[PDB]
Write an enzyme that holds these catalytic residues in place. Structure first.
Site: not given
Lengths: 556, 556
Positions: A388, A271-272, A216, A518, A210, A357
């Site tokens: 399993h 975002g999510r 990152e 952060k 954005k 979140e």
């Protein structure tokens, strides 16, 4: 907190304290042969049916009634209307929450500060459609005149998980589309091992951010550009190999990207909850814009079901209500999502973010700290793999774990005349059956006697073979996992998450919990350089840093 | 249950009730300048160092002392020797537990029923070595004389997870080796989408199944053989493209596999502890047998550390004890494993089985039901990915989650002069720092004022920006993620699991919890065939099956 003070919640909790040890699945089903009909929903989307069977849950008609009353008492419907009407329900940030506008196929106006949002939404979609068409047709070419064979999406969190999960899930529909790659970790091996398998001449990078200043994402982007330019050399070639999903025109231009190739979205898009917007560009490129619209259409369908269906029969609402029951009454910390579909191998991981979140909060709308549990820890692995791996604990462990079992009736690969899907289906059904029924001491004993076990050996091994059962589950079955159906399923959970947040009186749409890490990370960065001892933090942080500086040289 | 009745446990539980509200990380560190030195271990494996920093835990000298007393009281050391000495500690199945024999490089005799197990262990290793040599060198050829380019492992649970996680983690060491593929889901899309990308002339299949009758595995195996014979036609060609990891010579012969190509393991090798045996063949083929030996060597070093180190300084033991503390005293349901390393992206998933299938038990050795919690729900995502997905809940959620943060000092890809790794390390460090420290209301208010926030905006935002902190974590830092180091790290957790199991008085090596599901599935399989309504089960199972039969014909 609001919830604790709610009379309907108090009523629910008192009933629970009185009839808790009264709820037994085996007995409930034995006493009510019509239990499945009473506690299941069948939805016809016209593009496949969705059966939501919540009958294997520790509930009765009274409990469901009280649960529905809790939703009414907490104002679930009013909050829903506020969401769809464009009101700023994201109160801490003072913003609207309109992922529903992103897929509003009806194009009915949705106002934000008195202005319809749809024109902008469709403008970006049109831009996406045009771009996808050109890249897939081979009209968009690299700096050496070749067509794009690989698309690399670079982003973190929501700019990564959604597109990745969906492209993985709809892989069968990517015929005639370029291969897609997802780079999210700042860990250098992610971009590095990805670039090693690519040709600069036929690779297209999508920078999703954005602000276009995300540390990152931009670091990975700059690493990708250096790699590309090492081959291309000419800076003007960047425009043919890099596009951006953001709103920062200036920074996008500075990076070397052509402004007409900046696909924007808005602040009311979390975002999510962004795969439905420009963020989903890689989706559209991989499976085509037509399938992308199908995806959006499925969500839109579920959006309507959520809005027009009475609470008592409203899928998202009932899924959320059941979770509140297990979380706030039974005190269950987690929620397992187990889809019996390899294509959905990252579905649980996606909602681990979408749910956690959103609802991993502790401060209510009034600023009051909650005095009850909120969002659960979501986890899981796809069907039979997870079975399993960790099912031993779900069957005979000590934790109560509500589980959602999902599966498509029709497989994308009906190999061997349907033999594989038959076995998959049988296990899908058998697991929830076992989880509910269990096996008694008497039943296990009979089996051991039939095995000719010694009287002594039988008594020693017997307790280990008993399944206490009474473990609740939801079974969600849909006709086929098409783009439309996946859209419906994702939207269903988004709204479940929304309902629980309203009930808990928390903000499911902000994320202030990421700021501390952060901040502290930025301070540590400059201290890592050099061999000088660090002493500015607590003893552990200090010790860890100094061990790191010591072993930096160690030859192994 | 033994644990509850233990005097030491009661002492710990009593202390907990008295000093719980007295445990605060900020104060603990501020009060002890040597806290890091007192609560951290540095192991020199001679092939890299391992710093196990457990100082950011809600523990004091007394707690650790009481925990070690608990380990002694529960007889942890005697039980350990029983395992290493080949005794039948897997009491419900009357079997020894000897994965430590698999990597016993020292070749010290380990007897089972009066016979040294090492000669056979080494016999299989030598066969593995020879096979890998021939396949990787190109000596071993397909039915048309081509060299093997792809190796496909087909197995479930323990015959898949280990090899997959390890080859993914050691991808950098695979240069010169064939590509590896893992097919495990009975879901047909797994084998289907995998086979569509292979050439029958250069693909080698590995069928991992002890009995060689495992349903999921053999079905996938037969599907692969059918696809293979489709092109090869000649049944004798199967012997050049299929090998087996089992002991059933007859079944392996029938399949069409050459008996000399059956790599065997033993009953004292648990599935979730089998990657060290023949099951690890795919590992050896991918990264070479030399690297596979280093992997074994790493685990062997950790085995020794566990067997020769006093409890107070025993890594596996301490990790185990810290978990007992959070699980049985604090009541924590989960344990997050968060490695800040993309190559270790399947590390948490691996221990989800290793830990959960081992300790998700509820019947003690005396046959008595546990009256306390046992194995926790293990989950996680690698470093920064998970950080951008669910940390919001870990920082400001409502549940307490013990976390293990792991990271290698040296990266496999020191790109951009180590810029990526620098940021990765800063986040690894900053996150645990933040989890411990948090941010007070007073600190948060000052930030908001400095940001010039309005008085109205400040009061509204303030509480949402507070981090309560005091969240415990372990930080495990190692020099570099090499084959040897990975072996050491995996073995460390295996033993942590062993210690916890002995303390809980359960059997970490059986898995009776999987039988009910398998029995109920076999019964449903034939019922799915045909169009008849099923009415033989509870109403939910019936309803789900009838919906399936109905939608099976739906055109969408």
């Amino acid at each position: 907190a609001a919830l604790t003070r709610d009379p309907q919640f108090q009523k629910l909790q008192q009933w629970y304290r009185e009839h808790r040890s009264e709820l037994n699945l085996r007995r409930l089903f034995d006493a009510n042969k019509d239990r499945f009909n009473h506690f299941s929903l069948t939805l016809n989307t016209n593009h496949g049916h969705i059966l939501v069977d919540y009958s294997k849950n520790l509930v009765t008609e009274d409990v469901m009634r009280m649960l529905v009353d809790l939703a009414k008492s907490r104002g679930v419907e009013a909050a829903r209307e506020r969401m769809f009407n464009g009101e700023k329900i994201n109160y801490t940030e003072g913003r609207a929450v309109l992922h529903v506008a992103l897929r509003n196929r009806s194009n009915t106006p949705i106002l934000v500060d008195g202005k319809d949002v749809m024109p902008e939404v469709n403008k970006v979609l049109d831009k996406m459609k045009s771009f996808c068409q050109r890249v897939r047709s081979g009209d968009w070419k690299g700096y050496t005149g070749k067509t794009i064979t690989d698309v690399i999406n670079i982003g973190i969190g929501g700019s990564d998980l959604g597109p990745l999960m969906v492209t993985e899930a709809l892989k069968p529909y990517s015929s005639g589309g370029p291969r897609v790659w997802y780079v999210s970790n700042i860990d250098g091996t992610h971009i590095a091992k990805t670039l090693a398998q690519l040709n600069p001449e036929s690779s297209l990078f999508i920078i999703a951010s954005k602000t276009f200043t995300t540390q990152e994402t931009i670091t990975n982007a700059e690493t990708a550009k250096e790699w590309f330019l090492q081959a291309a050399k000419d800076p003007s070639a960047v425009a043919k190999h890099f596009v951006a999903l953001s709103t920062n025109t200036t920074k996008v231009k500075e990076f070397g990207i052509d402004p007409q190739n900046m696909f924007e979205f808005w602040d009311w898009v979390g975002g999510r909850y962004s795969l439905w917007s420009a963020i989903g560009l890689s989706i559209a490129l991989h499976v085509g814009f037509d399938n992308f619209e199908q995806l959006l259409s499925g969500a839109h369908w579920m959006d309507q079901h959520f809005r027009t269906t009475p609470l008592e029969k409203n899928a998202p609402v009932l899924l959320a209500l059941l979770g509140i029951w297990y979380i706030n009454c039974f005190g269950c910390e987690t929620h397992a999502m187990l889809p019996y579909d390899q294509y959905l191998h990252r579905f649980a991981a996606y909602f681990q973010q979408g749910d956690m979140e959103s609802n991993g909060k502790y401060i209510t709308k009034s600023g009051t700290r909650v005095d009850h549990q909120t969002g659960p820890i979501v986890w899981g692995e796809p069907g039979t793999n997870g079975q399993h791996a960790f099912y031993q604990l779900i069957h005979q462990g000590t934790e109560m774990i509500p589980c959602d079992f999902l599966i498509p009736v029709q497989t994308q690969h009906p190999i061997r005349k349907g033999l594989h899907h038959k076995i998959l289906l049988a296990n899908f059904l058998a697991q929830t059956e076992a989880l509910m029924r269990g096996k008694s001491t008497e039943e296990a004993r009979k089996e051991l006697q039939a095995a000719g076990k010694s009287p002594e050996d039988l008594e020693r091994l017997l307790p280990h073979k008993v399944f206490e059962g009474n473990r609740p589950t939801n079974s969600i079955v849909f006709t086929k996992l098409t783009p439309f159906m996946l859209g419906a399923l994702v939207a269903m959970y988004e709204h479940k998450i929304f309902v629980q947040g309203i009930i808990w009186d928390i903000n499911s749409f902000d994320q202030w919990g990421v700021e501390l890490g952060k901040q502290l990370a930025k301070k540590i960065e400059p201290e890592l350089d050099g061999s000088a001892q660090v002493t500015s933090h607590d003893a552990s942080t200090n010790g860890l840093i100094n061990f790191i500086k010591q072993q930096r040289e160690a030859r192994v």
